[PDB]
């Protein structure tokens, strides 16, 4: 019977009309637009200026817009990964060198980043968030993040790939975040003078594997296996992130790198153990009803779209 189903789904795998308006009536949900939560995370109760979801884009005027300027004490203490407080000497939309180290500074938005004339701060092209200043983010403008989606096919003991809705089912490594206790894709901000290649791999070993300061040293063949796994990665998306720490002058934009294990040999040798800024790490099933941190569901949608997997 399993083959009878398999053969049945093997044959079913301007002229477009949407008639849903006849059932519901007048539509116009406009739920696509992202509005961050009112209480800023880890700020001690500091609240933004609320904005309905139909008032977010920059084309609309909105004269009653009075955002609050807030910068976190950790960012204001000036570490190595934080930009200077006066952004007039910072050049945006091109690769900029600060202390001889390269920073990307280019946004994936087609219009680009517009510079305010009064203060020199960048303006978020993806809409209003009811808050100026940098907040918890260290860099003015685009904070480049790299996410690592290490995937394998969900298999049963017998070795057959699990199949739901006529498509093969994926499985990804998910970490439980230290700050807000929501499951998420491993990843982190791109450091100064380094590229997405080093960052994706380094953050996955530090967070999902605990290879920074929370696990014993790997064997000489396991490192070769992990290197073999990490040698074939495809950039599936470069999107804006529906991150609650985003402001009007500092926003997170992610590059997503998918490491897919077709055979499943390299993925099975991983000893998952939460480290750094992660509590627990596990192999989790990919589906459309997942409740993950920020816009990681969109990232998983892009991974399954590229691999023709179930979502």
């Amino acid at each position: 019977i399993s083959f009878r189903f398999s053969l049945d789904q093997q044959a079913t795998k301007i002229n477009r009309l949407n008639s849903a308006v006849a059932v519901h009536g007048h539509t116009a949900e406009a739920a696509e637009w992202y509005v961050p939560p009112e209480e800023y995370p880890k700020s001690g109760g500091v609240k933004r200026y609320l904005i309905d979801a139909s008032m977010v884009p920059l084309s609309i005027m909105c004269p009653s817009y009075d955002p609050v300027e807030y910068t976190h004490p950790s960012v204001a203490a000036q570490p190595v990964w934080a930009d200077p407080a006066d952004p007039r000497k910072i050049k945006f939309n091109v690769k900029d060198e600060v202390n001889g180290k390269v920073v990307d500074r280019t946004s994936c938005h087609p219009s680009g980043i517009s510079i305010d004339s009064n203060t020199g701060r960048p303006i978020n092209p993806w809409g209003r968030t009811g808050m100026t200043g940098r907040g918890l983010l260290g860099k003015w403008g685009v904070n480049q993040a790299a996410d690592t989606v290490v995937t394998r096919w969900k298999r049963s003991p017998d070795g057959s790939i699990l199949e739901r809705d006529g498509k093969k089912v994926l499985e990804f490594v998910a970490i439980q975040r230290q700050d807000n206790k929501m499951w998420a894709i491993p990843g982190g901000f791109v450091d100064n003078g380094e590229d997405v290649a080093l960052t994706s791999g380094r953050e996955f070993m530090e967070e999902a594997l605990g290879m920074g300061t929370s696990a014993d040293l790997m064997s000489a063949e396991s490192k070769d296996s992990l290197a073999a796994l990490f040698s074939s990665g495809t950039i599936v998306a470069r999107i804006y992130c529906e991150d609650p720490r985003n402001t009007d002058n500092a926003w997170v934009e992610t590059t997503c790198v998918n490491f897919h294990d077709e055979s499943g040999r390299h993925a099975a040798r991983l000893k998952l153990q939460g480290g750094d800024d992660a509590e627990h790490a596990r192999w989790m099933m990919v589906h459309g009803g997942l409740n993950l941190f920020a816009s990681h569901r969109t990232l998983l949608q892009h991974v399954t779209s590229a691999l023709n997997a179930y979502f």
Binding site: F5, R282, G289
Partner: protein, 432 residues
């Protein structure tokens, strides 16, 4: 008969029992006269209840929410120690039965399978069955299952502990009034108590009435019940297995709580409602068979909507998210279904839940010996042998051979003797 004056309370060392006066020991349990009261007064409501057409009496203790579950555990141990002597059969399994509060009818084949498996598991492991204790639904059903066990077996009868909120129980005033203990107190389930309407199940062997001073409020005993099962599990070095039959929206949260703390669950498929929701969700996420390939999150959402009927879409989303969160780890959920497993496979599901739990290899081999599953023990020994755990095999082989000799399992005796266990190297459990 003659009221007890002294009890053998087990020491904190776990090696002996001391004799002490009943009024001295029972002082540590408190009760609340009203909701406003917080400190409370010492409990005068403890003793035994006599139920019509039942020969034996069931002990009852009314205890506060702030009371130590170890003290309640000591009370249950003291009752068993009093009735059956000091060397009573210790439980190797704690069976928590949760599910539907309201009354429900199950199919006869499914009911027969659940009854047969639960009776076999309870009689082989001397298990402590913890339910809600009231005379409705899954608690009444579990009582009916253990009623035949109390008739067909002599000497030790496995306890059916009922942990219930005191504020909903008919006859609470009758139990409270008097001088404790109440030896053979008549319980009148048909007596018209005005504010309360939920009676106790007459087939439960022991009752813990958790009191907080409230009246006609449910769900106040859940945390204490979970704490008591965990305390019993640590004390007897025994796995805790939750069993889910039907159930409402709170049963989903209870199962969620159980899987977050590492406690395995056995979900009875085909019993309807939350059990069907949990069984679908697991089968959607894990089962490789063909009939489960058409399972979708949309049909699951439709099933949740038709059974639990939420008021809002967000409530439906939270219930669906919680249901998918419970079956995340495939080891901690075991689904029993009639059309897949079989009529005589419920005890096998209980044994798979036991093996999936956290415990030592020797204890798991002992549990496999109790259920008379030689193939499971052979596979466990082979897997342990392959994974470099040979030291633990040699460390537990003597005790496993001893246990096999005591419980009359000759095939297991042959199996343990074949893996280089010298017959003249046996050691006693105690010190001479």
């Amino acid at each position: 008969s003659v009221a007890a004056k002294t009890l053998l309370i087990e020491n904190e060392d776990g090696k002996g029992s001391t004799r002490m006066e009943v009024q001295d020991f029972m002082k540590r349990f408190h009760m609340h006269a009203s909701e406003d009261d917080k400190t409370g007064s010492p409990s005068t409501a403890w003793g035994t209840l006599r139920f019509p057409t039942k020969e034996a009496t069931a002990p009852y203790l009314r205890l506060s929410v702030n009371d130590d579950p170890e003290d309640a555990l000591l009370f249950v141990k003291a009752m068993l120690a009093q009735k059956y002597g000091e060397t009573y059969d210790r439980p190797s399994l704690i069976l928590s039965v949760t599910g539907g509060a309201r009354n429900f009818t199950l199919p006869p084949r499914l009911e027969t399978a659940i009854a047969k498996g639960l009776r076999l598991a309870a009689q082989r492991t001397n298990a402590w069955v913890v339910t809600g204790g009231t005379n409705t639904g899954v608690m009444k059903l579990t009582g009916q299952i253990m009623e035949a066990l109390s008739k067909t077996q002599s000497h030790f009868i496995p306890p059916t502990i009922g942990i219930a909120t005191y504020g909903v129980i008919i006859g609470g005033d009758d139990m409270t009034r008097g001088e404790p203990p109440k030896i053979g107190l008549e319980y009148e389930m048909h007596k018209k108590d005005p504010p309360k309407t939920t009676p106790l199940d007459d087939n439960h062997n022991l009752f813990l009435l958790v009191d907080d001073g409230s009246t006609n409020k449910f769900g106040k005993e859940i945390k204490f019940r979970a704490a008591f099962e965990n305390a019993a599990g640590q004390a007897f070095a025994a796995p805790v297995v939750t069993i889910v039959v039907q159930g409402g929206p709170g049963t989903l949260g209870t199962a969620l709580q159980a899987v977050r703390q590492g406690t395995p669950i056995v979900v009875v498929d085909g019993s309807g409602l939350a059990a069907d929701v949990l069984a679908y969700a697991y089968n959607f996420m894990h089962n490789p068979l063909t009939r489960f390939k058409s399972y979708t999150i949309d049909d699951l959402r439709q099933k949740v909507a038709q059974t639990f009927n939420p008021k809002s879409s967000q409530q439906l989303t939270n219930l669906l998210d919680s249901a998918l969160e419970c079956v995340q780890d495939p080891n901690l959920v075991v689904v029993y279904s009639l059309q897949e497993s079989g009529i005589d496979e419920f005890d096998d599901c209980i044994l798979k839940a036991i093996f999936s739990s956290q415990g030592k290899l020797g204890n798991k081999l002992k549990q496999a010996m109790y259920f008379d599953q030689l193939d499971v023990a052979k596979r466990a020994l082979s897997e342990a042998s392959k994974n470099g755990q040979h030291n633990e095999i040699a460390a537990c082989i003597n005790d496993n051979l001893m246990a096999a000799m005591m419980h009359n399992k000759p095939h297991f005796v042959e199996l343990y003797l074949g893996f280089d266990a010298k017959i003249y190297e046996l050691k006693p459990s105690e010190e001479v």
